[PDB]
Amino acid sequence: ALGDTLTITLGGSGGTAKVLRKINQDGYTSEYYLPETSSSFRAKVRHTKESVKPNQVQYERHNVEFTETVYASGSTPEFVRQAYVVIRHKVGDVSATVSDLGEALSFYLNEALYGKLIGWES
């Protein structure tokens, strides 16, 4: 699963296509990396389940992160750009409506909404 490389098209559909390489794997976690002359691309996948409690609900959290960092130039130091998403639900929940909610969240976010969001427009 997850192949030996993770494809990413920065800029949405129709953008420049990069291909990160599988570089590490442990305990349901895996990570992809690729070096570039002025920057680098980082992508990791993690899973986790919380411990059992006497009288509570057992939940599971997924996480996916993309990270992008550019090397220093002149006096300007290095800086990194990243964005990650998580999903949380009970152990035995129905998968399909969870997928529906995920589709909702993905569809809501678009380039226009990102532009509005970065402008601190609450």
Partner 1 sequence: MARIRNRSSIASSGMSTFYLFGTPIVNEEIIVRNTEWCSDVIGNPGDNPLDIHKQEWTIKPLSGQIIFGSGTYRSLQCPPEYCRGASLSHLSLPSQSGLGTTALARTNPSRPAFNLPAFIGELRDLPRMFKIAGDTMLRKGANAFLSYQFGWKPLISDISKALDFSATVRTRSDEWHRLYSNGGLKRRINLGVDIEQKKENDVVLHSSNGFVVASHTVITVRKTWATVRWRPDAGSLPPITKSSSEKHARALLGLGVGGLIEGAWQLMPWSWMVDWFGNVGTFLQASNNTIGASPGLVNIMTTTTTNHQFSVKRDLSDGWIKGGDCSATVTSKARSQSSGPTITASIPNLSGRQLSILGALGIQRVPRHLLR
Q: Check residue 92 for interaction with Ca ion (CB under 5 A).
A: no
Q: Check residue 11 for interaction with Ca ion (CB under 5 A).
A: yes
* Among Ca ion, partner 1, its own copies, none, residue 119 binds (CB under 5-8 Å by kind): none
Q: 110 to each of 6, 66, 78, how far by Cα in Å?
A: 22, 17, 28
Q: Which residue has the tokens 């949380």?
A: 88
Q: Which of these segments, 66-74, 81-89, 100-108, 112-120, binds partner 1 (CB under 8 A)?
A: 66-74
Pick from 14, 74, 120, 122: which binds partner 1 (CB under 8 A)? 74
Q: Check residue 28 for interaction with its own copies (CB under 8 A).
A: yes
Both tokens of residue 107?
């569809």
DSSP one-letter string for 35-84: E-SSEEEEEEEEEEEPPP-SSS--EEEEEEEEEEEE--BTTB--EEEEEE
Helix (H, G, I), strand (E, B) or coil at 120: coil
Applying CB under 8 A, the residues found at the interface with its own copies are 1, 4, 21-28, 35, 37-38, 40, 71-72, 78, 91-92, 94-95
Applying CB under 5 A, the residues found at the interface with Ca ion are 11, 100
